[PDB]
Enzyme design. Structure first.
Site, PDB file in Angstrom:
ATOM      1  N   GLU A  11      59.269  14.915  35.918  1.00 26.87           N
ATOM      2  CA  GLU A  11      59.708  16.255  35.515  1.00 26.87           C
ATOM      3  C   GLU A  11      60.515  16.325  34.233  1.00 26.87           C
ATOM      4  O   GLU A  11      60.592  17.386  33.617  1.00 26.87           O
ATOM      5  CB  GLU A  11      60.607  16.806  36.638  1.00 26.87           C
ATOM      6  N   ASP A  20      57.587  25.637  31.846  1.00 25.70           N
ATOM      7  CA  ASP A  20      56.866  24.573  32.495  1.00 25.70           C
ATOM      8  C   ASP A  20      55.385  24.565  32.018  1.00 25.70           C
ATOM      9  O   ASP A  20      55.001  25.351  31.147  1.00 25.70           O
ATOM     10  CB  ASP A  20      57.128  24.536  34.039  1.00 25.70           C
ATOM     11  N   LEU A  32      62.242  25.374  39.141  1.00 24.92           N
ATOM     12  CA  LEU A  32      61.647  26.674  38.764  1.00 24.92           C
ATOM     13  C   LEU A  32      62.619  27.866  38.859  1.00 24.92           C
ATOM     14  O   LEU A  32      63.323  28.090  39.854  1.00 24.92           O
ATOM     15  CB  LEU A  32      60.398  26.972  39.578  1.00 24.92           C
ATOM     16  N   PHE A 104      57.773  18.924  46.235  1.00 27.82           N
ATOM     17  CA  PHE A 104      58.712  19.398  45.281  1.00 27.82           C
ATOM     18  C   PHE A 104      58.017  20.203  44.193  1.00 27.82           C
ATOM     19  O   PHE A 104      58.496  21.214  43.750  1.00 27.82           O
ATOM     20  CB  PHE A 104      59.374  18.126  44.703  1.00 27.82           C
ATOM     21  N   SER A 117      42.768  15.783  52.816  1.00 24.39           N
ATOM     22  CA  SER A 117      43.627  14.715  52.252  1.00 24.39           C
ATOM     23  C   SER A 117      44.674  14.342  53.296  1.00 24.39           C
ATOM     24  O   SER A 117      44.969  13.180  53.472  1.00 24.39           O
ATOM     25  CB  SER A 117      44.403  15.149  51.013  1.00 24.39           C
TER      26      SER A 117
HETATM   27 CL   LIG Z   1      42.107  18.231  50.798  1.00 26.41          CL
END
Ligand SMILES: [Cl-]
Ligand SMILES: [Cl-]
Ligand SMILES: [Cl-]
Length: 162
Positions: A11, A20, A32, A104, A117
């Site tokens: 970051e 950003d 943010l 985050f 995932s």
């Molecule tokens: Cl996925």
């Protein structure tokens, strides 16, 4: 290497309001401020967050404080979320940091949308998880950072950050 050093690498640190990658007003270590186009809106949010008239500028300390807050808030949201919690519990320590990294950046809801995932990681099918994570806007928009997080998930080491 720890979560704080990992995210500071991803970051950066800026003491004045900046935009950003998506064009939103941010400050410090990826904090943010607002999605709003208004710089004034940003300045107001900023003052509200720090507790003082900042006029778009903060100190290092102030930046680290916000960072302590955000990391804590990310970890606690993971632990509170029905979809994220079980993945986190199933993971080793390094991989855990990787999930905290994603949360985050994109928030709990965002990460929770990565259904397949999530399932692949819970099943410890590293390679499959890496491939699914790559098929996302996230990967296409911030490929270098995404690759680093993806490699952390694949290998279970801090290689991508060293
Ligand atoms: Cl996925
Ligand atoms: Cl895609
Ligand atoms: Cl990037």
């Amino acid at each position: 290497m720890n979560i704080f050093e990992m995210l500071r690498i991803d970051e950066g640190l800026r003491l004045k309001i900046y935009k950003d990658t998506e064009g939103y007003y941010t400050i410090g270590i990826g904090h943010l401020l607002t999605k709003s186009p208004s710089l004034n809106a940003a300045k107001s949010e900023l003052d509200k967050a720090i507790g003082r008239n900042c006029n778009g500028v903060i100190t290092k300390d102030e930046a680290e404080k916000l960072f302590n807050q955000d990391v804590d808030a990310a970890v606690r949201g993971i632990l509170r979320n029905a979809k994220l919690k079980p993945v986190y519990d199933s993971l080793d320590a390094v991989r855990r940091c990787a999930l905290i990294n994603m949360v985050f950046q994109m928030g709990e809801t965002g990460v929770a949308g990565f259904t397949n995932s999530l399932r692949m990681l819970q099943q410890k099918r590293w390679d499959a998880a890496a491939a699914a994570l790559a098929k996302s806007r996230w990967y296409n928009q911030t490929p270098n950072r995404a690759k680093r997080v993806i490699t952390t998930f694949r290998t279970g080491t801090w290689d991508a950050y060293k």
